[PDB]
Design a protein around this ligand. Sequence first.
Ligand SMILES: Nc1ncnc2c1ncn2[C@@H]1O[C@H](COP(=O)(O)OP(=O)(O)OP(=O)(O)O)[C@@H](O)[C@H]1O
Ligand SMILES: Nc1ncnc2c1ncn2[C@@H]1O[C@H](COP(=O)(O)OP(=O)(O)OP(=O)(O)O)[C@@H](O)[C@H]1O
Ligand SMILES: Nc1ncnc2c1ncn2[C@@H]1O[C@H](COP(=O)(O)OP(=O)(O)OP(=O)(O)O)[C@@H](O)[C@H]1O
Ligand SMILES: O=c1ccn([C@@H]2O[C@H](COP(=O)(O)OP(=O)(O)OP(=O)(O)O)[C@@H](O)[C@H]2O)c(=O)[nH]1
Ligand SMILES: O=c1ccn([C@@H]2O[C@H](COP(=O)(O)OP(=O)(O)OP(=O)(O)O)[C@@H](O)[C@H]2O)c(=O)[nH]1
Ligand SMILES: O=c1ccn([C@@H]2O[C@H](COP(=O)(O)OP(=O)(O)OP(=O)(O)O)[C@@H](O)[C@H]2O)c(=O)[nH]1
Ligand SMILES: [Mg+2]
Ligand SMILES: [Mg+2]
Ligand SMILES: [Mg+2]
Ligand SMILES: [Mg+2]
Ligand SMILES: [Mg+2]
Ligand SMILES: [Mg+2]
Lengths: 559, 559, 559
Amino acid sequence: MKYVVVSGGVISGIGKGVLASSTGMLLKTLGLKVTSIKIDPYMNIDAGTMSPLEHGECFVLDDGGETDLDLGNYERYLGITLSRDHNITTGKIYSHVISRERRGDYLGKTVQIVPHLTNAIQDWIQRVSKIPVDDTGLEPDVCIIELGGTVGDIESAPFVEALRQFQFEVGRENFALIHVSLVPVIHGEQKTKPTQAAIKDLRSLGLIPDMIACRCSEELNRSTIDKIAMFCHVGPEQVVNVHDVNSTYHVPLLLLKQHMIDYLHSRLKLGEVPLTLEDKERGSQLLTNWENMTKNLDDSDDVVKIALVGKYTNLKDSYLSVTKSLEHASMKCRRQLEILWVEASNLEPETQEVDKNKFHDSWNKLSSADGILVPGGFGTRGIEGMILAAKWARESGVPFLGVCLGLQVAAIEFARNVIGRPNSSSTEFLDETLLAPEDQVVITMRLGLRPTIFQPNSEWSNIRKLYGEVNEVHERHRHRYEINPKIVNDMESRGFIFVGKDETGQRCEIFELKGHPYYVGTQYHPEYTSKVLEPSRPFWGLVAAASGTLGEVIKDINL
Amino acid sequence: MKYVVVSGGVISGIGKGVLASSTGMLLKTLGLKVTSIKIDPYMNIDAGTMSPLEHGECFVLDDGGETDLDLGNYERYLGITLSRDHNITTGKIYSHVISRERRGDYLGKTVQIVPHLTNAIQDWIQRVSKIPVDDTGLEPDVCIIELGGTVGDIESAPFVEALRQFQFEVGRENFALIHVSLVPVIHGEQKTKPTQAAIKDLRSLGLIPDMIACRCSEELNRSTIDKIAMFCHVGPEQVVNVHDVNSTYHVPLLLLKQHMIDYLHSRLKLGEVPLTLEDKERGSQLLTNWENMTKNLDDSDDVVKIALVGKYTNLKDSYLSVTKSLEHASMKCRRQLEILWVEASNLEPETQEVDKNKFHDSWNKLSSADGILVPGGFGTRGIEGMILAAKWARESGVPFLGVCLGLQVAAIEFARNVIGRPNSSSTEFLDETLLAPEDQVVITMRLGLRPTIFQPNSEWSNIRKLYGEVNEVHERHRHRYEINPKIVNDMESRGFIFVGKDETGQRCEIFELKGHPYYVGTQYHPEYTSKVLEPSRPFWGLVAAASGTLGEVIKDINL
Amino acid sequence: MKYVVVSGGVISGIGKGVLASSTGMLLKTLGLKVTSIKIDPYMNIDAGTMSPLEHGECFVLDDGGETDLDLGNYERYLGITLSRDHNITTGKIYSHVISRERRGDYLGKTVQIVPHLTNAIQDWIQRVSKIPVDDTGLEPDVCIIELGGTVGDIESAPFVEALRQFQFEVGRENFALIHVSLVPVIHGEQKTKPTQAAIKDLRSLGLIPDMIACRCSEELNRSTIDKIAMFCHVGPEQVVNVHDVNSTYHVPLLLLKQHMIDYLHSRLKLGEVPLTLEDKERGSQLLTNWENMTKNLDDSDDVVKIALVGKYTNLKDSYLSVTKSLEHASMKCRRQLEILWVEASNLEPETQEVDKNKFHDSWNKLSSADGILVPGGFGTRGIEGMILAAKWARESGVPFLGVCLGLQVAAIEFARNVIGRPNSSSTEFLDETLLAPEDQVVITMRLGLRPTIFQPNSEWSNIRKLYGEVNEVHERHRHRYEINPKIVNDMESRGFIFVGKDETGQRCEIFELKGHPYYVGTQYHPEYTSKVLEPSRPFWGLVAAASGTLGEVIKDINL
Ligand SMILES: Nc1ncnc2c1ncn2[C@@H]1O[C@H](COP(=O)(O)OP(=O)(O)OP(=O)(O)O)[C@@H](O)[C@H]1O
Ligand SMILES: Nc1ncnc2c1ncn2[C@@H]1O[C@H](COP(=O)(O)OP(=O)(O)OP(=O)(O)O)[C@@H](O)[C@H]1O
Ligand SMILES: Nc1ncnc2c1ncn2[C@@H]1O[C@H](COP(=O)(O)OP(=O)(O)OP(=O)(O)O)[C@@H](O)[C@H]1O
Ligand SMILES: O=c1ccn([C@@H]2O[C@H](COP(=O)(O)OP(=O)(O)OP(=O)(O)O)[C@@H](O)[C@H]2O)c(=O)[nH]1
Ligand SMILES: O=c1ccn([C@@H]2O[C@H](COP(=O)(O)OP(=O)(O)OP(=O)(O)O)[C@@H](O)[C@H]2O)c(=O)[nH]1
Ligand SMILES: O=c1ccn([C@@H]2O[C@H](COP(=O)(O)OP(=O)(O)OP(=O)(O)O)[C@@H](O)[C@H]2O)c(=O)[nH]1
Ligand SMILES: [Mg+2]
Ligand SMILES: [Mg+2]
Ligand SMILES: [Mg+2]
Ligand SMILES: [Mg+2]
Ligand SMILES: [Mg+2]
Ligand SMILES: [Mg+2]
């Protein structure tokens, strides 16, 4: 196994995940089988009970792991499936050796951070990097390890000791370190000093970078590259310049043209990995696919506006998988996506009494939609704001997708305005009395990859026709609440057909409304299964409907 | 609450525990109520499943906590009872916040080492320092915190952050730091440089020593004290000189004469603690008691030799509580104790085929006994070696105490040589066939303070007469095995009377043999209850019998 | 003496000098006498033989010290005169103790960085902070120490040890530390982590900030201020927010409104400094003056364009004193200054063969002048480019100031085009043959405050009338070359009158050309004497002439 560690910098939120994902994607263009491990040095065992103001969205895995959105970056760039073992945390690793000490496995010795916890980190990396994550089912060739946070944090201390020990457990030809760092620009001076401090903090912890990646608001000057290669003990070929590109799909193509792949190929002896003519063929095909879709994104600049209505829409990484899933769909349609970031609370009439401007800008943005998305949501504050947008899309014919909370507000709105239940509601939203017209109810979490089966007469529906001839869709869940199973056969009478369900028939998982060109929702999160070259079908349907091109996209799928 | 942190140095095994125990004992001479917390920065939740080649004996608490022998130092010097909460470990504190994160208590935030783990350490210290540990049942005035290991270890990093934060959560008048450091002597130069490195490592972690304690093989030169007070930013009154004294009972009297108590009194504003005339009276009485017993130890130099037969007897901290319990008994009798450190395996005839010298030196030492002790033991290797010494003491009339494994080998030996069971044995020692004559059997551990009740006709026995008129003794247990309850009434026929038992009658806990001046054993560990001014009664009995003074000691107790 | 140390950050080039200068200016508004010391931790004994691509212009002192442009910031904000002792360097301080060791002054002891070099730094700060630097001639009350570079550099290591020792040599009420740090903004997140690293590097070196100053491209969020006050152990009143203001004259007024002065007043006990009613009167007058000139700068937005022709004009701190001197003049005239940054080489016809665009943009900018400045210069490359602009200003009547190299190119141009010497030249520019018509010649440097005397019949000249009735001007020099003394009486025949000279008559130091409304030059650097409330007279003349307001400004001076 070869290891690329992507690490550090003076800040988090810089590009370690995009650069790791890009590096792994580029090694996959040589036909290498690439896996990835995220290390999040935090006490949380998982991202499941975090709130998205810190580290953005939760990402759900096939096994129902709730994880850092970096695993989502790896899944979509590398085209791989990860387990909850591919995320290591301080919480996970301390819990592991503390269980192993209580079990007596350390044979009466003092259990210590070195050797025992750093051994356990190295054992975890070696175990998990051998797990097959491609659909070929073969063991990986390269593992990208991304060390989250900053090097020289108190939290990352056990992991940097584990990684400098690992660098000698595996040979030098098997381990390379990339350090990502900020080059700030101050009065048009590009400042090298934060990167010099960061490389001295690496050396202080016993690590030496094989690459520097510099993140900057402009291209590095050759003065700046040479001063980095003086005060950090590296050659100028070992500095890469990653300059705030207009889209993340272009970042691999910077790293490619700057000869990073030629450096890593030599530095890790990658020509000595056995690769078949089929592997190099798949690798070269991926390069041509990626260059095609990046050219298409760059060239095909004609707009589509999708209004995204939800909480926290000022923090755009709170919806990273939604944003990326919408981009995959829009790039497949060769249209320039704009996301209209509508704070759902601003649409509520109670905002208009506080401020005219936010209410009118948010309703004008919602009115400016070619299509509407109500994504999954983190809490109750804004449910009426989302029901208002669910209504306006139904009323005005604008293409609509309801994902998770979106399906729940779509069924609530339709019950209120089309079934004729003028007070029907959500058990999540209110429990002040034991209401009889409860549309959304509980049946501690439903997580991971589950089968949704299509209902027998569903073939009229555009959502099934976007999946094609198939009877099952396999998709990822994250919900404790769902629709009340006694109400659904009354709701189907007005045309809100539950197109797909659990194999039991007791859980409702896809709907399409008959009386509308595209008014759909899913109880699964379709974002988490989206890939750069093959979008998630509900999101491809939404953007194709919003473009007016739905029939042409449904025709391409069923061919 | 006032806090004295005792910390660090270039080595462990130096004196932090003796100096902490001495400092706390001295603050108790002002009548202050003194508690203590040990921080062991290791992954072990407790010392229960460790082996004594690292950090010496396990110490058992009243609650059945299995802990570092430093809690035993605090219990005997301060005269206090500790809970398993008075030892903090890396294993305990990570397990605590990881449970609290899984329980959702951190309200959706990222759980991190700062603030969340260092808050949890500060909360634990504040909670536990308020627990009553004196028999007065009042809240403590001063807490001695002893930080185990070395400052600038990766393991101690979260605790030094917690302690430098704690120094500002409590006011400066409430927190003082003592740093203990090695002054090596090299060609008669006293070297200050290891202490200069240690004080710069403290400053680096944001802590400043209020005291330096220097451990040295000779008294510090005034050149050495002045060079410490130059290169460490302290006054010469802030350096104490702790010079390898002939016994640890003299260490408080160094720290007292060197004005450490006058420094701490001013530095922590201790005259502003409310103290009653009864508190200052108890405090002054303790000082006079301690000066009396130290003078008695220094003056009363006439020898008694107790042979201690067990595993690991080359590592004398493997028996610290036994050693200290024997010293308390010997000082009460005003006799100079020598411990004859007999490796039990060397007494076995199979040693004589390897080496004559170890077999003959160990049997000559055992023959040189005024009395014999078989302490509790860590494993099977040497059980025959301990049965040989149990025999020779019974045969030759030499006073014998069997503690734990000692009682078990004493009953095994008596079954083999006095009941006439020529093959009877221990379920711990052998299980190669389903033996019928099993004397030692299992009934996952029995731990903590339990009542032993004396049997009704037991009053002839010298062991009961050493406890006095009382019907119960309350003592601490650490055994999974004990005596077979069907055999005991046959064993009593030859005079091996089980003087005391559990309240059930089903568990046997004290015996005395009739036909011998002192041949006794306990299923409890009597060491763990011993105090400097009042020895453990089985050990007072052993040393008094070995001195020939048993009647005079039994007369002093029953007066 | 009170001490404010201004320090550190993840970068240099951030604001330590502007914030130090602003802080000292604000303490002067309380009537305190404020001095300043710069520490430049570099091997250069002085800035005299540096080149301005690193650390901008050289600044010349009254004693002829050649120093960091920070001493120029202190001189103009605080209104004080500094000596070469007010700049400490690694070169200066090592040279000092190495001389003192060679002289035997350390009495046979090992001379070491601690104590001997850090003592010498503390002795230098104490000596130099007592030197009178105001015109009142009294000893200072507060010394601002600005530590140049980054804290945790290898170069700054001896100075941070000296400063943490100094913090205890002087009492806490006498020493306060301000740390200046970068808060970068990345996708609209304000990132606290670089400042957390910087405050842990301070604590690591044994220093604790009394203030954080955060430099950011926008106002700090209260989330950001609170997260700084969590992870750096400070109160939220101890964080100041210094947000990229449109001019440096507004920076004191941020620090004032954010209660920094109220914090420092309490933290340094400044009400306990004895101050007279005259001191507080001068202090309050300075505040009203500063608020008046900042309002005038903000309000009076009507443009004047001064074209500045020289080397390195892309690096605007290469001319900081010129830029600031031009602003003082422009603010006195209540006009909005634009500086047209003309690279003198681009005006040369040889540029037009390489690139049309730079030649035409630079000549169009020069043509766009309301007035022209040829400042002092660092070398020969561009002398013809400066002679071209000297010509075009003379030819087209545009107001011209020649400072240093400017006077030399003005005399060269006039010799070439008005005396009729078609080949006359500079000994600095060419020495390929022993030319007879040398206008600029050598008489190793002429530095510091020197008297220029006005010639007796000079009173017609506008430059004398801008100084007023006076016979002497005292001004600062930095030249090895000057005008040939045999040529001047021929050059005066065509109206290029040398209005002022050295007291010898042998050195020529001010000229004015008769046939032009303002075509002047100085052999001294008039920038170095400029003050915020009272501009340098040659620069006040230039901007007033360029504004068309010269008569009104000359009338205000002579009133
Ligand atoms: N060069 C770039 N140009 C544009 N966007 C970029 C670039 N590099 C990264 N990004 C975007 O920046 C976001 C933040 O970066 P990333 O998540 O990779 O940062 P980080 O340092 O890894 O930490 P964190 O997980 O805390 O955000 C990414 O999710 C990606 O969308
Ligand atoms: N000045 C002294 N003279 C004699 N014996 C001493 C002295 N100081 C300490 N000791 C003895 O040294 C032993 C080892 O010291 P102590 O346990 O206090 O060390 P440490 O640094 O605390 O660490 P550890 O718990 O790992 O042994 C003590 O148990 C005590 O019996
Ligand atoms: N808040 C601000 N807004 C605008 N300009 C500023 C601000 N703070 C500083 N400046 C300008 O920035 C320049 C660079 O800052 P300054 O010289 O004070 O930086 P530094 O960290 O001190 O180091 P160096 O001396 O190396 O430049 C100053 O000369 C000043 O003109
Ligand atoms: O105020 C100052 C700034 C700088 N210096 C001296 O100049 C040296 C130059 O180092 P700088 O800190 O100026 O930066 P750098 O050259 O590493 O380049 P950037 O990352 O900023 O682009 C410093 O390391 C120190 O010796 C000072 O002495 N004082
Ligand atoms: O080989 C040597 C030894 C010492 N030295 C120089 O002498 C200085 C004296 O420092 P030392 O390391 O000699 O020790 P010290 O004075 O701190 O005293 P002890 O702790 O050893 O008792 C050192 O810090 C260094 O400057 C050398 O240059 N080389
Ligand atoms: O990739 C990552 C980023 C962050 N983290 C975890 O989140 C913690 C939050 O710390 P961050 O490094 O995210 O920053 P911060 O909260 O100090 O705030 P800014 O300065 O960036 O504004 C980190 O210290 C670490 O525990 C990770 O585990 N991995
Ligand atoms: Mg990441
Ligand atoms: Mg953060
Ligand atoms: Mg100890
Ligand atoms: Mg050890
Ligand atoms: Mg400066
Ligand atoms: Mg620089």
